[PDB]
Amino acid sequence: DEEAEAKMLEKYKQERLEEMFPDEVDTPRDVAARIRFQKYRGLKSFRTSPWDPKENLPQDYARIFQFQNFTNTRKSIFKEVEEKEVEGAEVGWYVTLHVSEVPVSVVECFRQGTPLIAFSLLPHEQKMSVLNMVVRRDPGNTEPVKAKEELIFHCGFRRFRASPLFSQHTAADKHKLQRFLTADMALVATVYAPITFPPASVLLFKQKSNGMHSLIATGHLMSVDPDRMVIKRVVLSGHPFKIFTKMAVVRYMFFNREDVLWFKPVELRTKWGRRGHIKEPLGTHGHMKCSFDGKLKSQDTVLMNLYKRVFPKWTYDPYVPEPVPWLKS
Amino acid sequence: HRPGPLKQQNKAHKGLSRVDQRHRASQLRKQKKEAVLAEKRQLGGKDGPPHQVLVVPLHSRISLPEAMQLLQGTVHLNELGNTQNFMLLCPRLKHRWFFTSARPGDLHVVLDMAKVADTILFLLDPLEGWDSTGDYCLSCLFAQGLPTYTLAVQGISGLPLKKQIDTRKKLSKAVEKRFPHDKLLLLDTQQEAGMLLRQLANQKQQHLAFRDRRAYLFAHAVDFVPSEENNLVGTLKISGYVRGQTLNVNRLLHIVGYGDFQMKQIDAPGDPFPLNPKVLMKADPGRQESLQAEVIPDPKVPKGTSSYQA
């Protein structure tokens, strides 16, 4: 009962922390920083620096399909559905369809009166792949949504449950993870889902405690490719406690001595724009000497970015529970 | 560097008939009008599927059975556990209807019945525009995709006369934040019901791209023939009008709430509701018929010496 309220307040505070300090992570004072952040790297420029799309793909990508050329394949399928004439039941014909292996429950569903509709799939539209599908936020709902919680997806006559990945909607080659669904602009949700050819509308629902589905987002299916990489970003902040001319001694970013050697080649930046490099560890406590391009202020905060490619979690559930009739809270 | 007078600079040496247009415009107009006439003739006529209309009341003060009593040519009333969706035939007006209704808040009911509908009729009350449930349904319905829609009001004539005009004035303004340029029909009497039916039959149709590229179907009748009842899995016979495209049996058939399935046969019995009053069509060839393959089918130191001095 009240532990739900506790988790709600924790999520509110965590969202406020995220919108205040974007991806700042406190260095673990116990576990070595090359163990927590082992699967991380640093990029000189987030936009222009390369990243292999096929590098270190998970086991789940062994299970999905991919288009060599999605645009030309979609053009071919749309052309052969608009131009050609296949021998089948025509439009307007009252037919009966003998469909093979259906659970009995669907039938009993028709017996209380729920509408029961069907549609025919295009080729390749039953196979699973990665759906990159753009959504904003409906202003009626202001409760937080974290990155990989379950949501109900209405996407092009199909209704399912999955754990999305929220990413920035930009024009770059790689896209930064958004740890929350930010309620002002347009983000991308990445899902393991069956293939659908666009256009299709997106309706993100969150299942509530009282059975209602609250509407959180709206949008369109943008693309079907698993080559879109989501890039989780971790920001490590240290303090420049000893300031010289174009050189400083920075503490609190690391605590072990060889952690500074591990994350040595990653460039540094300050909150007031100054860039530079780690010169050398001081010793035994993670203090480091860093060479910067200018003099520093006493209130400065040195910080460093670490990037790791994330993929969504395979929680594709084709069953969605029926709502209770929605009422205003 | 600008050269001065001591540098050599040499100034350059400068150095259809009226009747043919009328005939061409007439030809193009004839082409456009015949295309439009074919497309408008397809929907709701004798050679085409019924005009399917979803009635949604956007307030709790709206008495939906009153409106569906006003809406019902001859009426063939298909009837379910709680809902009454009926066929209407108007041979004087030469047009065939299938009226369904759905209440807002019931998400999957309105979303399915609005993803097969040709027309959506939103009911309103004279004083407030819509409710909170109606506003939520409107957000979902706009997001999913609206077909042709019409706005009808139910309680204008019940008010005293001296306010009715200005009541409608406020109502239009209350509507215009979401429905900017839309006519508010009044549905109070049988004559106004006929006017609304006429407005619904002749109106330009919004074409939704997703359902127009795909062959879809709304079940008018369903029956279950189980292979084994204890197994709870058997063949399903679903009867309805094909709506979107030509239907091929060699393709997977997705039921919206229950995933995709393999279909084996298409028969074409008699049309139960023709506008003006057992043959099997296609069986599945077990070779070119697609299979349900969602996932890939292929599976020397002393005892006390410290680490320093060592």
């Binding site: 790297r41 990508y61 399909f65 | -």
Partner: peptide, 23 residues
């Protein structure tokens, strides 16, 4: 012997490729 930049040469890019649909 490793750091955050050299260990990136360890990761391969030829095992878990999704099955490709051709044109």
């Amino acid at each position: 012997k490793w750091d955050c930049e050299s260990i990136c040469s360890t990761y391969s890019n030829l095992y878990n490729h999704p099955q490709l649909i051709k044109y």
